[PDB]
């Protein structure tokens, strides 16, 4: 219904967006290592539906 501002920080850079996010009740980042390196960290964005 209203515009929203999103700022996230993954392992590489920053993402700042201003859009119409349909945020869920509990936005979050699913976070998991890789099987061999474990040096960087892979993220799945569960912040907004659309």
């Amino acid at each position, epitope marked *: *219904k*209203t*515009q929203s501002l999103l700022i996230v920080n993954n392992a590489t850079n920053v993402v700042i967006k201003v859009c*119409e996010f349909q945020f869920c009740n509990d936005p979050f980042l699913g976070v998991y290592y890789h099987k061999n390196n474990k040096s960087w960290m892979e993220s799945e964005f569960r912040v907004y539906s659309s």
Partner: nanobody, 115 residues
């Protein structure tokens, strides 16, 4: 170019029912207010009804309890359900996209009622 699509008017005998529709596409920024406006040949733009994003409904005294507006959040569209027609309602209508900056306007729908 925000465009408002109007449909669903025409010729109906006294006592009939119709359903107008305005679909506003383009920018249509978030806190939008959608209205419906009346004009018969020789008169001015008569404010029929008004809806905000709050879902509140505002209607005039002219046609008390006979127009209804329906909201579609998924497509953000609007429908007029006009029931119990009377030949004083014979006037073309336009929809008013308030938006937040550049208020838009419709192309019109002819609504005609007589016997």
């Amino acid at each position: 170019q925000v465009q408002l699509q109007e449909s669903g008017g025409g010729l109906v005998q006294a006592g009939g029912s119709l359903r107008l529709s305005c679909a506003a596409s383009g920018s249509i920024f978030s806190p939008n207010t959608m209205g419906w406006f009346r004009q018969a040949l020789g008169k001015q733009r008569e404010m029929v009804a008004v809806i905000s994003s709050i879902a509140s409904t505002q209607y005039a005294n002219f046609v008390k309890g006979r127009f209804t507006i329906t909201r579609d959040n998924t497509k953000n569209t609007v429908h007029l359900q006009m029931n119990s027609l009377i030949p004083e309602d014979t006037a073309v209508y336009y929809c008013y996209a308030v938006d937040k900056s550049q208020d838009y306007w419709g192309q019109g729908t002819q609504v005609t009622v007589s016997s």
